[PDB]
């Protein structure tokens, strides 16, 4: 409980302070400041991009990692009374790593796109470079979070399948279909991230 | 079996003292039916080998008896809903005859769509018309049995809901174009004057100013049918329905303390008739009489030309209780109104100590004298 | 004149019900309830209508209409 | 008159013991009466009419049993007319039989 | 919505106004119900 | 003349007048219904009397509707900002007072129904107790009217 | 079906025919209260009132036809309430 | 004339109208469906009646859709900022009021299904309580329609 | 001339006076309602004494209303920013002091009622304890008048 409440306090306080500021700069007519335009323009497109690339990997890796130990823990625990589980049910781990694969694929593809502008004025940087930095962030975020959720789901359902096998071997083959429906979400994340990436150029 | 079970159950309420030959029992009855029970006792002896007629004496040192009221098809529900909040004290004023209209009236003010008034009327009518059938049908539809036991009261409130829906001039978002109007035809917005504003009104929304000569004047029906279609109608309707509810509530409260005085007179108690009604009615009347007068006064004293910079009713009420009229922002309604506001609240506040303390002090003096 | 006549009509209608009721009503326990029904009906129904008509007198603002309605109310009434 | 709560009285009855069964039946048919309880000690075996009530309870159970057996046979109960009580004598024993 | 639920709503709202806001001026609502002990309850 | 954002506080008033009132009425309903459902198991008859808290939850959403409509009908692009803050104050004052009312109606509308199931005599008490919850929404409405019409 | 549905069909038949024929009348008399209800278009602020009158007649027929369908629901329901 | 940013609020209104209504209708469905499943094992015959809360949660999703569609069809490339705020308010005011009705239908639907299973007489009373939940969504729709069309 | 935002803090005053007082009155009523309802079953005669904490929670909402009215009746578009902060102060002062009084009244008006049925002599003690609760709302009112009138 307590360690969550400390974080929750920071979270609520953060939004409460934004509401105070949002009212303040509105009512004092200072609302010409904090125009989202300068934030989304004076930020470097390379920042957005590299966060995107790193998200694409790391969130996929988190989804896959949860994926792995969630099923693995069950493989081991059922495996004590049913050693047969380990060889076949390991395909869930393979699909969790496939969510990581989807990460590294999309990340490497994104990583080819960025190049230096030799510019610092927003007009000399120009629309293509901003649009690329944002699109790359979007793609990397899309695949990353989609894979994050995909891998956790695959780990959960694959754990279930492993504990089904522990009671009857035939259940594994039948139940395994749900790991596809899990894995597909990560592929959909890839597909969208490709399309978000598909028009980009930098420099 | 039912009759025997009930008889022997009731017989277990009797008593036998150490010297006693008979049984002994006591009953409450209506004073009208003290004869009826004596005839039943005489018959009860005659329906047996016994000769002694089992007669009674009236008891004198009585506790407060169980409370009763007679009922019929039109009054059964009204008494049950009174009893549902609680059974009255003996000889107390009965709310139920006032409730027979008052509850239906407030319901109809609430439920005042003309078409819904008809549909509820129809439902209650189909229950009354089918009464001889329905009394023999399934008891298991308890929902239908409950509303059937309300059928006559539901009908009465249905009728009043028609009447309110008529004054509100609305069935299902529809109004009676059978009527004339205080609104005026488009040519009247174009008398050389206002025609320029009607050319703007030939591209965008416009408000009728209700100016004389253009306006169709005072109106003899309920609400003007045009307020069904007008975009500002809800503002007009709200100004009305608030002010209505206030006056109606005030009147029912003043009737409640009048019923209190009548109850105090029925018990014939000099303290209750004095220290109850007098301070309560004066407190309420001094606030509410002025408020209702102001509500009706504005509709007489103000009109279209005065509308721009017209005062607020609620402010002239608030600044009575608070005195706090800031010599500004609202026009005063009549000469000496500031003095009237001060006087009325002072007169009401001067009533409170009599209820708060002087009645208690007389009760304390009575307990000290009863020694 | 023309506003006061409707008031007199509705005032007289509810008042005359309260007046005539006791003459029309019979003896016995139903009497006082039936008469009280007429009396309270006249009071409440008169007052509710009286407020509505008095509130309809001297309108401080007139109806607001849309452009489309303003054109059509020229011919359809 | 219904503008106020109605007038009532308490009375004390020289209830003859052999009249009492019929007296109660006539007073229950009249219905316009409420008995005061003069027996605060009343309980299943402490009451004055233990056997008569316990007989009525068993007779109700036997009635419920036979009624259910006729209902189980899908036969309608006849359901017509109104009937008086049994008189004061123990003719309820023929109903038990 | 209207004929059923807002009807029952209005019914109960006005009933409540009766039970306290009106009745509390004058009606004590404390006592014992007179019960007609009768064969009517069969 | 008047600020562009001026209507924002007005419409957030109108929304708030509803939203918080609906949250109040929702909680009030939800709690009461849960109690009613639970009690009805041994009480097939009390149901129709037991719904009373639920209706008292409903009127809170209506008090919100009154103010929300009043504000909405008095919005315009040209609104004087001062009118918009009046309307915001109104919409919060009914909205959150209705929320508070809904909390009290909920807890009362659970416990009172349970107590009435255990002891029918509680009913009158529960009525009175529930009035002192629902009146919060009314006080919210009173000030919200004063503000919106000032 | 059942008798409950037939009883509802009787009520909606009567109420429907009443309101729908009254609408058919208010539309055929071209009543001004119906301006917000008629499906007018920009082309009805041209030629003259004959354009809106053609629409008022068509909508008057809609309500008359719907009332005819509610008469059929009535006749059906008055059979079903006896048959079920 | 108008700010190019300004359609953002009306769009957040169109989104909110759906999203918060969906969160509501989802929660109401989810709670009720759990209840139906946990009831059915004992009383399968009740399913065809005890489904009603889910249908009412569906109504909330519709109230969202109505306003969301209405806002979206009312948007324009240069929208008046005042109209954009009206749409935001419509969007929240249905959207969150639908959330509140979704909470209410959820809690009542789950508890009221268990209650019905344990006492079938409850079902007729439960419907009243469920309408008193679902109407909060409708009051939110009333205001949202008013704001969008004002 | 005075800053046009200045009326914002004034309406935040009137709202806070009402809202927080309603939150206090709600929690005071809710806890008291649970208490009275849970208690009633063992000693039903105690309800008409045991309502009194609820009345006190009602009085807290009245103290909020008195301030919220007085603020609202005093506002104007031209309001000097000084007076607007006074009104915010008054609003928070009564409102949160009422919330405080409502927390006390709730906890006391629960536990004291549940004690009172076990031991009736507690009742006078519970009243005395509650005086020292309800007075917090009065101190909030006292400060709120002293602020908002000067």
Structural domains of chain F, count: 1
Residues whose CB is less than 8 angstroms from the CB of residue I27 and which lie 6 or more positions away in sequence, other chains included: F100, F103, F104, I57, I99, I102, I103, I106
CA-based nearest residue in chain I for residue F119: I41
- Is H132 within 8 Å of F57 when comparing Cβ atoms? yes
Residues whose CB is less than 8 angstroms from the CB of residue A20 and which lie 6 or more positions away in sequence, other chains included: none
Question: Which of I103, I39, B106, E21 lies closest to F128, judged by CA?
Answer: E21
- Is E36 within 8 Å of D33 when comparing Cβ atoms? yes
Q: Write out the DSSP string of I7-71.
A: HHHHHHHHHHHHHHHHHHHHHHHHHHHHHHHHHHTT-GGGHHHHTHHHHHHHHHHHHHHHHHHHH
The C-alpha of F52 sits at a distance from chain E's nearest C-alpha, in angstroms, of: 8
In 3-state terms, what secondary structure has residue A37?
helix
- Is B315 within 8 Å of I73 when comparing Cβ atoms? yes
In 3-state terms, what secondary structure has residue B206?
strand
* Inter-axis angle of helices H52-74 and H7-40, nearest 10: 170
- Residue F19 sits in which domain range? 1-150
The span from the CA of I145 to the CA of I86, in Å, is 10
Question: Which of D50, F77, C55 lies closest to H150, judged by CA?
Answer: F77
Q: Write out the DSSP string of chain G.
A: --HHHHHHHHHHHHHHHHHHHHHHHHHHTT-GGGTTTS---GGGSSS-THHHHHHHHHHHHHHHHHHHHHHHHHHHHHHHHHH-
Q: For residue H16, what is the enclosing H or E element?
A: helix H7-40
Count of CB atoms within 10 A of residue H61's CB? 21
Beta bridge partners of D35: B27
Sheet holding B25-30, edge to edge: B56-58, D8-13, B25-30, D34-36
Q: Which residue of G26, G35, G44 is the best one to mutate when testing the C interface, meaning the one whose CB has the most C CBs within 10 A?
A: G35
**Whose structure tokens read 């039970």?**
E19
Count of CB atoms within 10 A of residue B293's CB? 13
Q: Which residue of F53, F58, F63 is the best one to mutate when testing the E interface, meaning the one whose CB has the most E CBs within 10 A?
A: F58
* Inter-axis angle of helices B151-167 and B142-149, nearest 10: 70
State residue H101 phi and psi, 5-degree precision: -65, -35
Count of CB atoms within 10 A of residue G48's CB? 10
Residue I113 · residue I53 · CB < 8 Å: yes
Residue I94 · residue I143 · CB < 8 Å: yes
CA H116 to chain centre: 24
Whether chain B lies against chain A with 3 or more Cβ pairs closer than 8 A is no
Say which DSSP state B71 is in: -
Q: What does the block give as tokens for C24?
A: 């029309």
The C-alpha of E27 sits at a distance from chain D's nearest C-alpha, in angstroms, of: 11
The span from the CA of H19 to the CA of H41, in Å, is 33
User: F22 to chain H: which residues are within 8 Å by CB?
Assistant: 96-97, 100-101, 136, 139-140
The span from the CA of H119 to the CA of H109, in Å, is 15
Residue B195 · residue B169 · CB < 8 Å: no
The radius of gyration of chain F's CA atoms, rounded to the nearest angstrom, is 18
Q: Is I2 on the interface with A (CB under 8 A)?
A: no
- The CA distances from residue C45 to B104, B166, B225, C7, C36, in Å, are 11, 12, 21, 13, 14
The span from the CA of I14 to the CA of I90, in Å, is 8
The radius of gyration of chain E's CA atoms, rounded to the nearest angstrom, is 16
Residues in chain E: 42
State chain A's maximal CA–CA distance in angstroms: 71
The span from the CA of B208 to the CA of F12, in Å, is 29
Beta bridge partners of C64: B207
Residues in chain D: 97
The span from the CA of F40 to the CA of H113, in Å, is 12
Q: What does the block give as tokens for H10?
A: 């009306």
Q: What does the block give as tokens for B48?
A: 């047996």
Residues in chain F: 150
The span from the CA of H18 to the CA of H71, in Å, is 11
Question: What's the first-to-final CA gap in chain H, in angstroms?
Answer: 21
The span from the CA of B52 to the CA of D17, in Å, is 10
The C-alpha of E29 sits at a distance from chain F's nearest C-alpha, in angstroms, of: 10
Q: What does the block give as tokens for B285?
A: 């009347």
Count of CB atoms within 10 A of residue B57's CB? 9
Q: Is F5 on the interface with A (CB under 8 A)?
A: yes
Question: Which of B97, B153, E37 lies closest to B88, judged by CA?
Answer: B97
User: B322 to chain I: which residues are within 8 Å by CB?
Assistant: 69-70, 73
- The full set of domain ranges for chain G reads 1-84
Question: Which of H20, H3, H23, H12 lies closest to H71, judged by CA?
Answer: H12
Q: How many CA atoms lie within 13 A of F105 on its CB side?
A: 35
Method: cryo-EM
State residue B171 phi and psi, 5-degree precision: -115, 120
The span from the CA of I54 to the CA of I36, in Å, is 10
The span from the CA of F71 to the CA of G71, in Å, is 45
State residue B282 phi and psi, 5-degree precision: -65, -45
State residue B312 phi and psi, 5-degree precision: -100, 130
**Whose structure tokens read 């335009």?**
A37
């Amino acid at each position: 409980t307590g360690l969550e409440l400390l974080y929750l306090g920071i979270f609520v306080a953060f939004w409460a302070c934004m509401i105070v500021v949002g009212i303040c700069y509105t009512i004092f007519d200072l609302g010409f400041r904090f125009d989202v335009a300068w934030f989304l323009t004076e930020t470097s497109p390379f920042m957005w991009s590299n966060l995107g690339i790193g998200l694409a990997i790391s969130l996929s890796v988190v989804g896959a990692a949860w994926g792995i130990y969630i099923t693995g823990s069950s493989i081991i625990g059922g495996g004590v009374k049913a050693p047969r589980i380990k060889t076949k049910n390991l395909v869930s781990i393979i699909f969790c790593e496939a969510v990581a694969i989807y990460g590294i694929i999309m990340a490497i593809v994104i990583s080819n796109m960025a190049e230096p502008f030799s510019a610092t004025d927003p007009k000399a940087i120009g629309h293509r470079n901003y649009h690329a930095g944002y699109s790359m962030f979007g793609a990397g975020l899309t695949v990353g979070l989609s894979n994050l959720f995909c891998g956790v789901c695959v780990g959960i359902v694959g754990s279930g399948a492993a504990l089904a096998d522990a009671q009857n071997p035939s259940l594994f083959v039948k139940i395994l279909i749900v790991e596809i429906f899990g894995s597909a979400i990560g592929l959909f994340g890839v597909i969208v991230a490709i399309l978000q990436t598909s028009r980009v150029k930098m420099g | 079996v039912r009759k025997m079970k009930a008889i022997y159950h009731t017989l277990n309420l009797c008593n036998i003292d150490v010297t006693q030959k008979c049984l002994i029992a006591e009953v409450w009855c209506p004073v009208t039916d003290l004869d009826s029970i004596q005839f039943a006792l005489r018959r009860g002896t005659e329906h047996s080998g016994s000769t002694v007629p089992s007669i009674l004496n009236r008891m004198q040192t009585n506790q407060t008896p169980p409370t009763y009221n007679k009922t019929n098809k039109f009054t059964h529900g009204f008494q049950n809903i009174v009893d549902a909040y609680g059974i009255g004290t003996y000889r107390e004023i009965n709310p139920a005859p006032y409730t027979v209209i008052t509850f239906p009236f407030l319901f109809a003010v609430m439920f005042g769509d003309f078409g819904h008034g008809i549909l509820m009327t129809l439902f209650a009518v189909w229950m009354v018309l089918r009464e001889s059938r329905i009394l023999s049908q399934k008891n298991e539809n308890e929902m239908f049995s409950m509303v059937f036991s309300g059928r006559y009261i539901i009908l009465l409130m249905g009728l009043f809901s028609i009447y309110t829906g008529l004054i509100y001039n609305d069935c299902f978002s529809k109004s009676l174009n059978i009527f004339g109007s205080s609104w005026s035809v488009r040519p009247m917005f174009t008398i050389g004057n206002w025609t320029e504003e009607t050319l703007l009104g030939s591209s965008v929304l416009q408000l009728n100013p209700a100016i004389p000569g253009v306006f169709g004047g005072p109106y003899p029906f309920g609400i003007d049918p045009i307020w069904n279609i007008a975009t500002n109608k809800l503002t007009f309707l709200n100004s009305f329905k608030m002010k209505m509810s206030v006056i109606l509530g005030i009147i029912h409260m003043l009737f409640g303390v009048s019923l209190s005085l009548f109850n105090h007179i029925y018990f014939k108690k000099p303290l209750n008739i004095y220290f109850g009604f007098i301070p309560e009615i004066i407190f309420m009347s001094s606030l509410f009489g002025y408020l209702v007068i102001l509500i009706f006064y504005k509709w007489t004293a103000y009109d279209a030309h005065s509308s721009r910079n017209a005062p607020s009713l609620l402010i002239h009420f608030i600044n009575m209780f608070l005195f706090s009229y800031p010599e500004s922002g609202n026009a005063m309604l009549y000469s000496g109104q500031k003095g009237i506001q001060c006087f009325l609240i002072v007169v009401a506040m001067l009533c409170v100590p009599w209820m708060l303390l002087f009645k208690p002090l007389i009760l304390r003096h009575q307990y000290l004298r009863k020694k | 004149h023309s506003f006061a006549l409707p008031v007199i009509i509705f005032t007289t209608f509810w008042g005359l019900i309260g007046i005539a009721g006791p003459w029309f009503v019979p003896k016995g326990p139903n009497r006082g309830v039936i008469i009280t029904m007429l009396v309270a009906t006249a009071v409440c129904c008169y007052l509710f209508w009286l407020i509505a008509i008095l509130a309809q007198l001297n309108p401080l603002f007139g109806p607001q209409l849309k452009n489309e309605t303003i054109w059509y109310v020229r011919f359809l009434w | 008159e219904l503008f106020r709560s109605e007038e009532m009285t308490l009375a004390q009855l020289f209830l003859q013991s052999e009249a009492a069964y019929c007296c109660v039946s006539e007073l229950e048919e009249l219905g316009k009466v409420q008995f005061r309880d003069l027996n605060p000690d009343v309980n299943v075996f402490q009451r004055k009419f233990v056997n008569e009530v316990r007989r009525c309870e068993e007779m109700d159970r036997k009635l419920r049993f036979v009624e259910k057996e006729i209902r189980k046979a899908n036969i309608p109960i006849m359901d017509t007319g109104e009937n008086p009580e049994v008189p004061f004598p123990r003719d309820m024993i023929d109903l038990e039989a | 919505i209207l004929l059923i639920m807002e009807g029952l709503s209005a019914f109960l709202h006005a009933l409540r106004l009766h039970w306290v806001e009106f009745q509390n001026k004058f009606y004590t609502g404390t006592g014992f119900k007179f019960l007609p002990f009768s064969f009517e309850h069969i | 003349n008047n600020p562009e954002y001026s209507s924002f506080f007005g419409v957030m008033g109108a929304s708030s007048a509803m939203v918080f009132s609906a949250m109040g009425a929702a909680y009030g309903t939800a709690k009461s219904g849960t109690g009613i459902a639970a009690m009805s198991v041994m009480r097939p008859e009390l149901i129709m009397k037991s719904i009373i808290p639920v209706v008292m939850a409903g009127i809170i959403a209506i008090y919100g509707l009154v103010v929300a409509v009043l504000i909405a009908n008095s919005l315009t692009d040209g609104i004087t900002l001062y009118r918009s803050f009046l309307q915001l104050g109104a919409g919060l004052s009914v909205g959150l007072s209705g929320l508070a009312a809904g909390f009290a109606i909920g807890i009362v509308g659970d416990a009172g129904v349970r107590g009435t199931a255990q002891q029918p005599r509680l009913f009158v008490g529960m009525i009175l107790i529930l009035i002192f919850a629902e009146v919060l929404g009314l006080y919210g409405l009173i000030v919200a009217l004063i503000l919106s019409t000032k | 079906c059942g008798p409950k549905l037939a009883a509802c069909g009787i009520v909606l038949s009567a109420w429907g025919v009443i309101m729908l024929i009254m609408l058919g009348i208010f539309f055929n008399v071209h009543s001004a209260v119906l301006i917000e209800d008629v499906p007018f278009t920009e082309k009805d602020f041209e030629n003259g009132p004959q354009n809106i009158y053609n629409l008022y007649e068509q909508v008057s027929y809609n309500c008359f036809i719907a009332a005819g369908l509610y008469l059929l629901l009535g006749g059906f329901s008055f059979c079903q309430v006896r048959l079920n």
